[PDB]
Amino acid sequence: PLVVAASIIAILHLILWILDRL
């Protein structure tokens, strides 16, 4: 469960960082 949480959160960070760069 914690792995899943951390992974979702890391991925959302990635998505939001990429969108900000674009």
Binding site for ligand MPG (CB under 6 A): 1, 4-5, 8-9, 12, 15-16, 19
Least separation in angstroms between residue 4's CB and ligand MPG is 4
- SS3 letters across 1-22: CHHHHHHHHHHHHHHHHHHHHC
Residue nearer to ligand MPG on the CB measure, 5 or 21 = 5
Minimum distance from residue 2 beta carbon to ligand MPG (Å): 8
Instruction: For 11, list phi and psi in degrees, rounded to 5.
Output: -65, -40
- Give the nearest distance from C-beta 21 to ligand MPG in angstroms: 13
Distance CA 13, CA 6 (A): 11
